[PDB]
Amino acid sequence: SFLWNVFQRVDKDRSGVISDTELQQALSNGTWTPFNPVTVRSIISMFDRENKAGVNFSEFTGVWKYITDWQNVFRTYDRDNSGMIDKNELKQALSGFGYRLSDQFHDILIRKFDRQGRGQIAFDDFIQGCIVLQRLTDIFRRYDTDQDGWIQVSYEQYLSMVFSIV
Amino acid sequence: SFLWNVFQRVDKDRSGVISDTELQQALSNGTWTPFNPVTVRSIISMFDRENKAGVNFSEFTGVWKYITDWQNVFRTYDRDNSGMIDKNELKQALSGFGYRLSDQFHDILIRKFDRQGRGQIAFDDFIQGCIVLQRLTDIFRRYDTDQDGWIQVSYEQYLSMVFSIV
Ligand code: NA
Ligand code: NA
Ligand SMILES: [Zn+2]
Numbered sequence: 380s381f382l383w384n385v386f387q388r389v390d391k392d393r394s395g396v397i398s399d400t401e402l403q404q405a406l407s408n409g410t411w412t413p414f415n416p417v418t419v420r421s422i423i424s425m426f427d428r429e430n431k432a433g434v435n436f437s438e439f440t441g442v443w444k445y446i447t448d449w450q451n452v453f454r455t456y457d458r459d460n461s462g463m464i465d466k467n468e469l470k471q472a473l474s475g476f477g478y479r480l481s482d483q484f485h486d487i488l489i490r491k492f493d494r495q496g497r498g499q500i501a502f503d504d505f506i507q508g509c510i511v512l513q514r515l516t517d518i519f520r521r522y523d524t525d526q527d528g529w530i531q532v533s534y535e536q537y538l539s540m541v542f543s544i545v
Numbered sequence: 546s547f548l549w550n551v552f553q554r555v556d557k558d559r560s561g562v563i564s565d566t567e568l569q570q571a572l573s574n575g576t577w578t579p580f581n582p583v584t585v586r587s588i589i590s591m592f593d594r595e596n597k598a599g600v601n602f603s604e605f606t607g608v609w610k611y612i613t614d615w616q617n618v619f620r621t622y623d624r625d626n627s628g629m630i631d632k633n634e635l636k637q638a639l640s641g642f643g644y645r646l647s648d649q650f651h652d653i654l655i656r657k658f659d660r661q662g663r664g665q666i667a668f669d670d671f672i673q674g675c676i677v678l679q680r681l682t683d684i685f686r687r688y689d690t691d692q693d694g695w696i697q698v699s700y701e702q703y704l705s706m707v708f709s710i711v
C-alpha cells in the first residue's frame with residue numbers, strides 16, 4: 380500500500396522492475412558514499428524468484444522487510460549511535476546471533492568487511508559481512524558431521540568446499 | 546627492445562604506464578570476447594611493484610614473459626588445437642603441474658572457471674583458474690602441518706582460512 384508509493388519512487392525507469400542500480404540509489408549507508416553494490420546484488424538475488432536481475436513489487440515487499448529488519452539490528456548494536464559499528468559492537472552483534480568467536484578474530488572481520496577503511500563497519504558492509512558468515516557457517520556445518528566445531532577434510536574436499544562458497 | 550614497440554602500442558594514452566583497460570584490450574582469449582578482467586587484474590597486481598594500478602615498461606617485460614609462458618602451457622594441452630581446453634585436457638594440464646585430482650572434480654573446476662558457459666575453458670579463464678588453485682594450495686599447505694593431504698581445523702581456523710584467500 381504505502382509500499383507501492385515507495386516502489387514507484389525507486390522504480391525510476393517505471394519498468395515495473397527495480398534494478399540493481401535503482402535499489403542502490405534508494406539506499407544510504409550513512410557515510411555519503413554509494414551503498415555496497417555487492418550488498419545490493421545479494422539482496423536482489425535473495426528475493427528475485429525469476430532470473431530477472433531485479434525485483435517486482437511483490438518481491439519488493441520482501442526486500443523492504445529485510446532492509447528494515449537489518450536496520451533494527453544495526454541500530455540496536457551501534458549504541459554510541461555514530462552510524463558505524465566498531466570492534467566491540469561487532470562482537471556484540473555476532474554474539475547476539477549466536478557466534479562464539481575470539482576477540483582478536485574480530486580484527487580480521489573488520490579488516491575484511493570495511494570498504495571505508497576506518498576500523499569500523501557501515502550498514503551496507505555489515506549486511507554483506509553477516510550474509511558471508513551465514514554462508515561459511517552453512518558450508519562448515521555440512522562437513523562437521525558430529526557437530527563439535529571441528530572438521531577433518533582432505534585436500535580435494537577442501538577445494539570443493541571453498542568452491543561451494545561462490 | 547622489440548618489447549618497447551609492443552609497450553608503445555599497448556600504452557594508448559602514452560602515459561608511460563599500462564593500465565588494466567589497456568592490457569585487457571591488447572589481449573585476446575580466442576573467443577572474440579573481452580579478456581577476463583579479473584585475469585588482467587591479477588597479472589597487473591603480480592608485476593606492479595608500486596601501488597600504481599598499472600605497469601611501467603620494466604615491469605611489463607615481466608608481464609610479457611608471463612603471458613607467453615602461459616601461452617606455451619595452454620597450447621601444449623589444447624592438443625585438438627581448438628582454442629578451448631576441455632575436461633580431459635584440463636586433467637592433463639593440472640596433472641602436468643603435479644595436481645592429483647579426481648576425474649569428477651574436474652567437473653567442478655570447469656563449471657567454476659568457464660565464463661563462456663560451454664563446458665570448456667578459454668585462455669584467460671585458464672590462467673585465473675590456475676592462479677586461484679595455487680592460492681588455495683598455498684593456504685591449505687599452511688594448515689597441513691605434517692604434509693599428508695589432510696587438515697583438521699576448528700570453526701574459527703576455517704573462517705580465518707577462507708578469509709586469508711581474498
Ligand atoms: Na567434527
Ligand atoms: Na595433515
Ligand atoms: Zn526499474
Ligand SMILES: [Zn+2]
Nearest residue numbers: 457461463464
Ligand atoms: Zn557505533
Ligand SMILES: [Zn+2]
Nearest residue numbers: 459461464465
Ligand atoms: Zn563506535
Ligand SMILES: [Zn+2]
Nearest residue numbers: 525526527529
Ligand atoms: Zn568430531
Ligand SMILES: [Zn+2]
Nearest residue numbers: 560562563564
Ligand atoms: Zn597508459
Ligand SMILES: [Zn+2]
Nearest residue numbers: 623627629630
Ligand atoms: Zn582443446
Ligand SMILES: [Zn+2]
Nearest residue numbers: 625627630631
Ligand atoms: Zn577439445
Ligand SMILES: [Zn+2]
Nearest residue numbers: 691692693695
Ligand atoms: Zn596428518
